[model samples]
Target: AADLDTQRSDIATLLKTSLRKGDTWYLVDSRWFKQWKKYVGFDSWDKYQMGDQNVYPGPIDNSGLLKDGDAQSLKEHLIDELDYILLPTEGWNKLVSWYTLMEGQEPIARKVVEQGMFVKHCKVEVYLTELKLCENGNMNNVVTRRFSKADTIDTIEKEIRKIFSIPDEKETRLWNKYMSNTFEPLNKPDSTIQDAGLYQGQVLVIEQKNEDGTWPRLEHHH
Candidate 1:
């Protein structure tokens, strides 16, 4: 219901603070923490700055200082306080999720990104036959395939073979590259791209499968 971007700016400034030994006392830096304990009570204290490496259990007693746990604390508080996610970014920006929510940022989820909403259309690229394939690379000849609830790999392969004249069905291997550098041989040809949680703008690297049931292996590319 609020704009997240506006909310983030108010809290964008970060501090190298952590929860002091007592949990109530907020320590700004670990360098001078020994004097903090002495001034409070304990004379012997290891002076170590918490930084982002440390976290607290909950929003610290309204200390008004943003500790590392503040982000997580805000998320939990919002989840308990509201029905929807406090901050839902375009894709999976978790950092923005809490940053916007904490500052009461003008944050709201896009209609298209909201879960359980009926998406009218989803499309993706399907690489057919042989051409140099790279995750970020694209070609003018590749066809844009529309996503279907019932579409399977077999169905896709049929269409590709029909259009591209891929003579033998069993000759080539299908690779579902969720990551740019890594891919698993899509052994089950009947599986659908939708089943893999795959969608638009991601590359589908097509290469011929080795007869021994292995794909050509190389490091970090294609």
Candidate 2:
């Protein structure tokens, strides 16, 4: 039998442990609540980046329960920070909602198609264009990386350098290369991946200082 009560408790525990604290609850997995938490070690269900913190919850597998409790947990955790997302609708009556309805009054069966309850994990393919890891001095060493909206651009650069076996020097420059062949200098090293509005599968470039101690030009395109 699918123990619904235990399922609900599992959701509650995940809500308290894995969630990112802020004006609104931030999460990389849109399917977070639906997935039951069974493992104990990294039990917070955190497997993605949240701000500077990297939370890793191995899998989004089932916990031997009859139902998932993500949506109910979200309603319990957030409402004021509501915006666009990709949450599936089952029905309030079909399943019991959460406990404290969060500073607002709305019956469980209000019938609203709420989406984007939390931030979706952004998975993108990275490339070292200068090394020509893929195509003609264009696409090379193409590798895919996953990140949360709260992650920073500096994190991405570090990975790019790591992939190429390049050490982090004080003079190396990195940029997000657009398809139109335009380069955006990373003036702000501390800028978050979300702040740059980087979406899934976005490409980034690495530019090192010239032999004479000069970096890529702000007007440069690669």
Candidate 3:
């Protein structure tokens, strides 16, 4: 028989390690919880008192336990170790507001989802530390020589002038500025504007399972 207690302890240890390292993991969003609540008629997700207030253990494989006592205790154990519990949409929004105020920063980027003017997904929590690599690292080193060669100032300037009918003098000045300073350190391009021959880095944290079945790869940059 599989030892449920040992399995729970192992998972707890793994999560604790990842949390301490500032790694990000994905959790079920609050909207999913709301749907579940509507179906089950539970006032709150944590109706059962579990080990840790944050941990909420649910079915991994949806297998039923032969004994009710075992099932209840296991569920409680899972709940106790949960690092993230699903929050209501309003609750998540409040959390984002509180975090912004407390941290004195807005999210570096956000993923917007629209379903006919109403957002289907809002308040997607991301671990910024992991995503910071994209912004902090050098793209020059990563891009192949062929691509970098193609991204020269002369090539970019010719294309822009040809496409936009810009005056030679204006195009020359623009090209000079771009070649000299656009890719310089600490220079940030406007997020809302589109520019030809310019590159911008966006950070994203992704959760990928490792061979050991633990969540890893909290941060990735491309």
| Top lDDT prediction, candidate number | 2
After superposing candidate 3 on the true structure, give the runs of residues whose Cα lies further than 4 Å from its correct spot. Answer: 19-24, 28-222
Ordered by TM-score, highest first, the candidates read: 2, 1, 3
lDDT against true structure, model 3: 0.28
Better of 2 and 3 by TM-score: 2
* Candidate 1: residue 123 Cα off by (Å): 16
- Local error of candidate 3 at 48, Å? 11
User: For all candidates, what are the clash counts?
Assistant: 8, 14, 9
Q: What is the C-alpha lDDT of each candidate?
A: 0.36, 0.40, 0.28
36-144 per-residue lDDT for model 1 (tens digits)? 2232233224424222223211211222222244242212222211222211123213333432223432222222211111332321111112212332122234655
Tens digits of per-residue lDDT, candidate 2, 131-173, equal 1111113444576765645555677677767766666554567
The local lDDT score (0 to 100) that residue 111 gets in candidate 2 is 17
Per-candidate TM-score against the hidden true structure: 0.32, 0.41, 0.20
Q: Where does candidate 2 stray beyond 4 Å?
A: 1-138, 179-181, 216-222
